[PDB]
Design an enzyme around this catalytic site. Structure first.
Site, short mmCIF file in Angstrom:
data_model
loop_
_atom_site.label_atom_id
_atom_site.label_comp_id
_atom_site.label_asym_id
_atom_site.label_seq_id
_atom_site.Cartn_x
_atom_site.Cartn_y
_atom_site.Cartn_z
N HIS A 6 0.81 -1.12 0.01
CA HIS A 6 0.07 0.08 -0.01
C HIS A 6 0.81 1.16 -0.04
O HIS A 6 1.67 1.45 0.80
CB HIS A 6 -0.97 -0.03 1.22
CG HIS A 6 -2.01 -0.82 1.07
ND1 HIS A 6 -2.43 -1.85 2.16
CD2 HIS A 6 -2.87 -1.35 0.06
CE1 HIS A 6 -3.52 -2.52 1.66
NE2 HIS A 6 -3.68 -2.29 0.43
N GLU A 10 1.87 3.75 2.93
CA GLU A 10 2.42 2.99 4.36
C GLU A 10 3.72 3.15 4.20
O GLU A 10 4.70 2.21 4.26
CB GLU A 10 1.84 1.70 4.23
CG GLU A 10 0.35 1.72 4.62
CD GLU A 10 -0.36 0.45 4.29
OE1 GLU A 10 -1.64 0.20 4.25
OE2 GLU A 10 0.31 -0.71 4.56
N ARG A 14 -3.38 4.75 -2.13
CA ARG A 14 -3.19 3.58 -1.56
C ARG A 14 -3.30 2.46 -2.63
O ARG A 14 -2.37 1.47 -2.56
CB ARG A 14 -4.28 3.14 -0.85
CG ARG A 14 -4.64 1.86 -0.40
CD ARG A 14 -6.06 1.70 0.40
NE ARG A 14 -6.51 0.37 0.38
CZ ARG A 14 -6.47 -0.49 1.43
NH1 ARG A 14 -5.46 0.18 2.40
NH2 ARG A 14 -6.66 -1.83 1.83
N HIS A 45 2.79 -4.02 6.46
CA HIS A 45 1.91 -2.96 6.39
C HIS A 45 2.10 -2.06 7.61
O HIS A 45 2.75 -2.33 8.51
CB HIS A 45 0.43 -3.28 6.18
CG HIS A 45 0.25 -4.06 4.92
ND1 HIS A 45 -0.74 -3.68 3.87
CD2 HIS A 45 0.42 -5.33 4.55
CE1 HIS A 45 -1.03 -4.54 3.16
NE2 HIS A 45 -0.03 -5.70 3.35
N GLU A 69 1.30 -5.10 10.98
CA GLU A 69 0.91 -3.69 10.84
C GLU A 69 1.76 -3.08 11.64
O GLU A 69 1.81 -3.24 13.09
CB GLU A 69 -0.50 -3.43 11.42
CG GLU A 69 -1.49 -3.87 10.37
CD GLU A 69 -1.57 -3.34 9.17
OE1 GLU A 69 -1.20 -2.21 9.17
OE2 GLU A 69 -2.32 -3.84 8.12
C1 LIG Z 1 -4.39 1.32 8.50
C2 LIG Z 1 -4.35 -0.41 8.21
C3 LIG Z 1 -5.22 -1.19 9.07
C4 LIG Z 1 -4.66 -0.36 6.61
N1 LIG Z 1 -6.20 0.07 6.41
C5 LIG Z 1 -6.43 1.02 5.62
O1 LIG Z 1 -5.78 1.92 5.22
C6 LIG Z 1 -8.13 1.30 5.40
C7 LIG Z 1 -8.30 0.71 3.92
C8 LIG Z 1 -9.88 0.85 3.87
C9 LIG Z 1 -10.39 1.85 3.04
C10 LIG Z 1 -11.97 1.99 2.68
C11 LIG Z 1 -12.60 1.13 3.23
C12 LIG Z 1 -12.14 0.08 4.11
C13 LIG Z 1 -10.98 0.10 4.35
N2 LIG Z 1 -8.37 2.50 5.73
C14 LIG Z 1 -8.26 3.20 7.02
O2 LIG Z 1 -8.53 4.30 6.93
O3 LIG Z 1 -8.22 2.28 7.98
C15 LIG Z 1 -8.14 2.90 9.19
C16 LIG Z 1 -7.95 1.97 10.26
C17 LIG Z 1 -7.06 2.06 11.19
C18 LIG Z 1 -6.68 1.19 12.43
C19 LIG Z 1 -7.69 0.11 12.62
C20 LIG Z 1 -8.55 -0.11 11.53
C21 LIG Z 1 -8.81 0.68 10.48
P1 LIG Z 1 -4.01 -1.76 5.74
O4 LIG Z 1 -2.72 -2.02 6.09
O5 LIG Z 1 -4.60 -1.64 4.41
C22 LIG Z 1 -5.17 -3.63 6.38
C23 LIG Z 1 -4.84 -4.62 5.74
C24 LIG Z 1 -5.77 -4.28 4.33
O6 LIG Z 1 -7.01 -3.60 4.23
O7 LIG Z 1 -5.35 -4.76 3.24
C25 LIG Z 1 -5.05 -5.75 6.19
C26 LIG Z 1 -5.08 -5.94 7.68
C27 LIG Z 1 -5.21 -7.08 8.49
C28 LIG Z 1 -5.11 -8.34 7.50
C29 LIG Z 1 -5.03 -8.22 6.29
N3 LIG Z 1 -5.06 -9.51 5.65
C30 LIG Z 1 -6.08 -9.72 4.64
N4 LIG Z 1 -6.16 -10.68 3.91
N5 LIG Z 1 -7.19 -8.94 4.60
C31 LIG Z 1 -5.00 -6.89 5.58
ZN LIG Z 2 -1.91 -1.81 4.14
#
Ligand SMILES: CC(C)[C@H](NC(=O)[C@H](Cc1ccccc1)NC(=O)OCc1ccccc1)P(=O)(O)C[C@H](C(=O)O)c1cccc(NC(=N)N)c1
Ligand SMILES: [Zn+2]
Length: 304
Positions: free
Chosen positions: A64, A67, A122, A192, A266
């Site tokens: 992403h 990040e 992203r 991530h 994360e």
């Molecule tokens: C900040 C972290 C939590 C990242 N998430 C984001 O950026 C998300 C992406 C998003 C956008 C629109 C609608 C839904 C989701 N945006 C966001 O603002 O996240 C805030 C947030 C912060 C903390 C906890 C939860 C959410 P990520 O690194 O992208 C999380 C990642 C993913 O969503 O691909 C993830 C986390 C855990 C497991 C997995 N694995 C999987 N197979 N899904 C994947």
């Molecule tokens: Zn991510």
């Protein structure tokens, strides 16, 4: 212009992959596993003491674009590997016995865009038929319950799952590489931020992996180890219930390929800075993360 305690642009990271390899040919070889949509080279560094039929751990960063601490960590990891080989007993044994396949930036096009235009980008930067909207979420683009949950079918959305699994050149490239090396790859680690968590399968469904108890114990130990350095607190557990359900993720896909140790990290923080983690925290963040990655490596090695 490369520094390990600052965020580096792609031009600099690319030059770094060449330089670090040139300077450590007995520990690093560089290959390209494909091109991005916009024609940048997807580099992969094989880090380890070369030898016949070695097992391997695969780690990628920069799925992403925004990040940035993820990208920084892969670079940090490679330096630590080459600097401490021969001097620190664990890393010496790690590199003697296995290879790390380190993919420093998967989504290069998106990363470049966060430097040139939009810091909060992203997705990838590929075009989509019938719309002006750009990009697919690479971590919704894998063949893992593809697009069935926690994902959008709309190209204008941040979690667009793509036109099909592996529709993106980058995710296709990563999947192809792992498929071609399934025999050797014993763990998959995808980096991530943010949230300070270690997640393992599954995220595309509420079902649990057969080795759930082992993965929980492993993640539990890894986070304890991480906390020893600066007191940073991580939580851990299955993706679906620990953060949210989401299909098409690479960790779930890798696991279903038979890679039994599959984790999404994360990194810092918990939202005070979010994706805009200050460079002043790069060193401490990477240092504590190294401990968790090395713990997992040590465990995987003892379970070959
Ligand atoms: C900040 C972290 C939590 C990242 N998430 C984001 O950026 C998300 C992406 C998003 C956008 C629109 C609608 C839904 C989701 N945006 C966001 O603002 O996240 C805030 C947030 C912060 C903390 C906890 C939860 C959410 P990520 O690194 O992208 C999380 C990642 C993913 O969503 O691909 C993830 C986390 C855990 C497991 C997995 N694995 C999987 N197979 N899904 C994947
Ligand atoms: Zn991510």
């Amino acid at each position: 212009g490369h520094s390990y305690e600052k965020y580096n642009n792609w031009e600099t990271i690319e030059a770094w992959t060449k330089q670090v390899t040139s300077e450590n040919p007995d520990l690093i070889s560089r290959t390209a596993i494909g091109t991005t949509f916009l024609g940048n080279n997807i580099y992969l560094l094989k880090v380890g003491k070369p030898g016949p039929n070695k097992p391997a751990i695969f780690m990628d960063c920069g799925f992403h674009a925004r990040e940035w601490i993820s990208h920084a960590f892969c670079q940090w990891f490679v330096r630590e590997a080459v600097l401490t080989y021969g001097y620190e007993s664990h890393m010496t044994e790690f590199l003697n016995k296995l290879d790390f396949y380190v993919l420093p930036v998967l989504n290069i096009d998106g990363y470049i865009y966060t430097w040139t235009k939009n810091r909060m980008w992203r997705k990838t930067r590929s075009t989509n038929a019938g719309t002006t909207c750009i990009g697919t979420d690479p971590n919704r683009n894998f063949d893992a319950g593809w697009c069935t949950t926690g994902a959008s079918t709309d190209p204008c959305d941040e979690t667009y799952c793509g036109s099909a699994a592996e529709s993106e050149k980058e995710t296709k490239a990563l999947a192809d590489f792992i498929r071609n090396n399934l025999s050797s790859i014993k763990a998959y680690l995808t980096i991530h931020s943010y949230s300070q968590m270690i997640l393992y399968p599954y995220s595309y469904d509420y079902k649990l992996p057969e080795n759930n108890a082992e993965l929980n114990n492993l993640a539990k130990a890894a986070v304890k180890e991480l906390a020893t350095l600066y007191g940073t607190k991580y939580t851990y557990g299955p993706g679906a219930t620990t953060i949210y359900p989401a299909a098409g993720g690479s960790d779930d896909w890798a696991y279903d390929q038979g890679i039994k140790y599959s984790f999404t990290f994360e990194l810092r923080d918990k939202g005070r800075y979010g994706f805009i983690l200050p460079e002043s925290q790069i060193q401490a963040t990477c240092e504590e993360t190294m401990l968790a990655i090395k713990y997992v490596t040590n465990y995987v090695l003892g379970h070959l």
